[PDB]
Amino acid sequence: KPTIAAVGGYAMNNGTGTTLYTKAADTRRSTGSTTKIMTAKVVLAQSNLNLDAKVTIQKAYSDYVVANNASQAHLIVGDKVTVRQLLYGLMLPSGADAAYALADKYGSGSTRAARVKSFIGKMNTAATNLGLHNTHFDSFDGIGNGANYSTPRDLTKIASSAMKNSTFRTVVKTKAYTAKTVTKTGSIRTMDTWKNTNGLLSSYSGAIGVKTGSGPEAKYCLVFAATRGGKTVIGTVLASTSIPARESDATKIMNYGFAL
């Protein structure tokens, strides 16, 4: 069994569901931004989903990242951005401004405030539906209250369920993406390139996902997935100690899973 820095860890055969690795797999902790995995999931599960639907970037999205000094995708107020582009902004650079734009768009209500509450309601429903018992969301980005928790097992199950969507898989394995946005004056703008925060996509052969995460209480987290020889391993590492250690914990666990 590999020794990892993270205090919570889990991994399974994505195809069979057979547990491969365990370390406090059912102890709840803070998720931080790994929470965006569920935002993506809920969005992609909407009946009224249209990847080509444009969204105007509101001043609110911008002020939000500032008020919370959160990670962002550098969305420009006034710009029209497609739902598909927002999914790359959410998952690659971990854009909290993009997460907000998505919650506001797919929540149900007459005000932005009403719609984000309804959206977070959806996130929690999608969890219950997965038959989860240790997961609870209080935000759409993971930057909201201590009532935002999960466990290495629940989160892995949430990721495995999202990896079932082809658009999700396409996004999560992309190393770089350059959004071409429509401007206030109707012109095309070339945004600065978004690079994926997940280093495994470049350091670990076969790596296909899924999403990094961090926070004041969540520390450094990583939900990984790699496929080798037709066998795909998927897992989660919660509360590792550094960006490098998070990727290391994951690498050690995956190497262990593939050789079992």
Q: Which is nearer to Na ion, 116 or 223 (CB)?
A: 223
Catalytic residue among 23, 30, 36, 71: 36
Taking CB under 5 A as the rule, which mask of x and - marks residues 80-109 in contact with Na ion?
Answer: --------------x---------------
Q: Which is nearer to Na ion, 83 or 92 (CB)?
A: 92
**34, 135, 198, 212: which one binds Na ion (CB under 5 A):** 212
Half-sphere exposure (Cβ direction) of 25: Cα atoms closer than 13 Å: 13
Which residues 6+ apart lie within 8 Å of 254 measured at CB?
11, 204, 224, 226, 233, 235
Query: Is 240 a binder of Na ion (CB under 5 A)?
Result: no
d(CA 94, CA 73): 7
* Residue closest to Na ion, measured at CB: 212
Catalytic residue among 23, 30, 33, 41: 33
Pairing of strands 8-13, 19-23: antiparallel
Q: In the annotation, is 36 catalytic?
A: yes
The token duo for 47 is 């009946």
Peptide bond just before 237 cis, omega within 30 deg: no
Q: Which class for 45: exposed (0-12), middle (13-18), buried (19 or more C-beta within 10 A)?
A: middle
Q: Which is nearer to Na ion, 36 or 122 (CB)?
A: 36
Catalytic residue among 23, 30, 41, 94: 94
- The verdict on whether residue 211 carries a ligand-binding annotation is yes
Applying CB under 5 A, the residues found at the interface with Na ion are 94, 197, 212, 214
Active site amino acids: 33, 36, 94
